[PDB]
Design goal:
Elements lengths: L13 E3 L6 E3 L17 H11 L9 H5 L5 H15 L5 H4 L18 H9 L6 H19 L5 H18 L7
Antiparallel strand pairs: 1-2
Bound molecules: zinc ion (3 copies).
């Protein structure tokens, strides 16, 4: 197995996947690494299994159909993985914890949002459809773009949004377009 966490790239107290060489800190894995379960398979392996079981799940989909899906176990897992893929980027630090807004010439957003809040919401089964999860995720970046205006720091929102959107199109097998 790897000797660093797959998500944050640090050593420490790591739990090892039994079916691939990845390793995780307890709360870096989403969901948090389970108390028992030998063998244990990580989220990457669980997602791979879904694709393997149903190869046709990789044929192209319309975003609108994806967003209306109810959050049954497989869609819950996919949104957990997509959240995890955003945490995998180091620039996620900027969006992880609860933000505050006091900048001359801007007003804070009406509905602040952050990754740890989305994490909690997923853990508490608060989203009933994929749409709920994706709306909160996109709201993170949209709030950032609006607040930081022409400051170059706005680009961090663009960059982390691009990682979210690429992973969304991959995980949920959105139909490729130009
Ligand atoms: Zn970690
Ligand atoms: Zn694995
Ligand atoms: Zn099938």
């Amino acid at each position: 197995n790897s000797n660093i966490c797959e998500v944050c790239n640090k050593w420490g107290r790591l739990f090892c996947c039994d079916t691939c060489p990845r390793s995780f800190h307890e709360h870096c894995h989403i969901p948090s690494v389970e108390a028992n379960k030998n063998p244990w398979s990580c989220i990457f392996c669980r997602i791979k299994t879904i694709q393997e079981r149903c190869p046709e799940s990789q044929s192209g989909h319309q975003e609108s159909e994806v967003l209306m899906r109810q959050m049954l176990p497989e869609e819950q897992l996919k949104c957990e993985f997509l959240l995890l893929k955003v945490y995998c980027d180091s620039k996620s630090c900027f969006f992880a914890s609860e933000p505050y807004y006091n900048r001359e010439g801007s007003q804070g957003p009406q509905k602040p949002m952050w990754l740890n809040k989305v994490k909690t919401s997923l853990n508490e089964q608060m989203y009933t459809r994929v749409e709920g999860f994706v709306q909160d995720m996109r709201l993170i970046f949209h709030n950032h773009k609006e607040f930081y205006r022409e400051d170059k720091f706005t680009r961090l929102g663009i960059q982390v949004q691009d990682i979210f959107e690429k992973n969304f199109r991959n995980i949920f097998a959105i139909q490729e377009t130009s």
